[PDB]
Structure 1
């Protein structure tokens, strides 16, 4: 074992999935730091350095990293791979990004199995000397992700189907909502310029009051103020912060992709009183 294969990912969810597949033979680092907003992130010369020293770059695609393609033009002779190939997208429903793919496909554990397969293929293609390790690690990690679905599904199934309204800030949960049968309500369809303007707040407030929805959420990379304003204006409790666009730090409460899915499902379930 000389120098380990170096993988750089755009953001932290992919970093942790890829690091599980890489195991001991590669080192995976994320360009964005935990807690940073990933859609409109502004890369720096230090990010260029990190990507250029990599052997493989991984990104989400599906319109997530608005910065990536321009950034990647600065990078020479480093292969890249988009990790969402083969996932059927859900379109964004409204706003200036309506009709394009919603990027947050990783919030469906079933989709995460496709993330794993695509990351496996890219590692095997660009570091074939370690193909057997990547293949073994990908199989073991996919087993964990597959087994994750049944307990999560059962817990959210405790919420009566007609009461399954997931009210969040960014509409980042469309894939989880599809999987587990939630109707989706959000303050803005995708992170961009307008996040919590009036008309956005008004629409959500009216939906909450009409259907007596009991809880509203924010997310870990954006402001909690619009959600808290909505809960103050309505009967709904502020259910806290869901994790979707970033892990916590390694020593924080959401250090891994598995911990992110578990934590988000648990916080939703608690907001509905289990």
Structure 2
């Protein structure tokens, strides 16, 4: 069987949807952990060196010049577009605020379901290239998975239609909602823009508190992969309740609602729309 390594649980889950029984799949970043900065364990280094295919997000999630995945593949003498593949290739890239330069991308493309489809098609193409005798399975599974994601994307495009503009604001700890905000017409705000920044100074909390006095949503949200303390402080100081945990940089643990890319996005759409409509 093809040996496949994925950098995190979101990419690994998309790969499972395409490949099912046919591959030997290893996922590096544990569920619930930050995928931006991680220290691979010896088993991760071994599996990466022995893999036939390595999938990573790209666009400044784990692949900055000094970032953990770049070091891993360079130490292993692996080559981009031969051994390892950025599943985000082909998306319309959004950058960090005020930026336009390579290396300053916003990585969170998968929160737009159109980009989840792009990721999945890229995964399927590279699995078919390296394991052509399972093409029938990969293509069949891809076609059904894409159809399912497209139906959810159509739902997402009208999910927030009944909510007034003066309370359409998704508030999370990390500024990970740019692609969702652009695709689905719901602006977003944050404590820290990206996880490599300082995660929750009193000044960052104060900046968000001041923003929430201008546009005041009925709910805040907190991601499954961050320390909740900063958002608990935002909630206490603003009086706006945390409505639900949501899934941004990780799927949920197995058996918990949201334990796949599809299920985490359905969860996010339901919980965010329900909380904002209060």
1:178 to 2:182 alignment: yes
Structure 1 stretches lacking a partner, 5+ long = none
Quote the offset at 1:73 in angstroms: 2.1
Distance in 1, Cα, partners of 2:138 & 2:270: 31
How many residue pairs match? The answer is 270
Distance in 1, Cα, partners of 2:103 & 2:48: 31
2:27 to 27, 30, 35: 30
Contact 1:214–1:235 under 8 Å retained in 2: no
List, as ranges, runs of 4+ consecutive aligned residues in structure 1 with deviation greater than 6 Å.
Answer: none
1:115 to 2:119 alignment: yes
Distance in 2, Cα, partners of 1:89 & 1:148: 22
1:9 to 2:13 alignment: no
Distance in 2, Cα, partners of 1:189 & 1:46: 31
Distance in 2, Cα, partners of 1:98 & 1:207: 29
Partner of 1:138: 142
Distance in 1, Cα, partners of 2:20 & 2:41: 28
Distance in 1, Cα, partners of 2:24 & 2:266: 25
Quote the offset at 1:76 in angstroms: 5.4
Partner of 1:59: 56
Contact 2:168–2:276 under 8 Å retained in 1: no
Write the deviation string for residues 228-250 of structure 1: whole angstroms up to 9, x where unpaired.
11111113111232101111222
Quote the offset at 1:19 in angstroms: 0.9
Write the deviation string for residues 80-111 of structure 1: whole angstroms up to 9, x where unpaired.
1110111011111169x998211010010111
Partner of 1:166: 170
Partner of 1:18: 15
Distance in 2, Cα, partners of 1:24 & 1:203: 49
Partner of 2:157: 153
Quote the offset at 1:183 in angstroms: 1.6
1:202 to 2:216 alignment: no
Write the deviation string for residues 196-255 of structure 1: whole angstroms up to 9, x where unpaired.
112211111011112222222221111111111111111311123210111122222221
Partner of 1:75: 76
Partner of 1:221: 225
Partner of 1:40: 37
- After the TM superposition, which residues 230-269 of structure 1 pair with which residues of structure 2 at under 5 Å, given as runs? 230-269=234-273
Contact 1:19–1:27 under 8 Å retained in 2: no
Of stretches 52-61 and 75-84 in structure 1, the one that deviates more from structure 2 is 75-84
Contact 1:209–1:235 under 8 Å retained in 2: no
Quote the offset at 1:139 in angstroms: 1.2
Distance in 2, Cα, partners of 1:263 & 1:98: 32
Structure 2 stretches lacking a partner, 5+ long = none
Partner of 1:91: 95
1:50 to 2:47 alignment: yes
TM-score (norm: length of structure 2): 0.91
SS at match of 2:160: helix
TM-score (norm: length of structure 1): 0.92
Of stretches 70-79 and 47-56 in structure 1, the one that deviates more from structure 2 is 70-79
Contact 1:62–1:102 under 8 Å retained in 2: yes
Distance in 2, Cα, partners of 1:156 & 1:220: 23
SS at match of 2:45: helix
SS at match of 1:43: coil
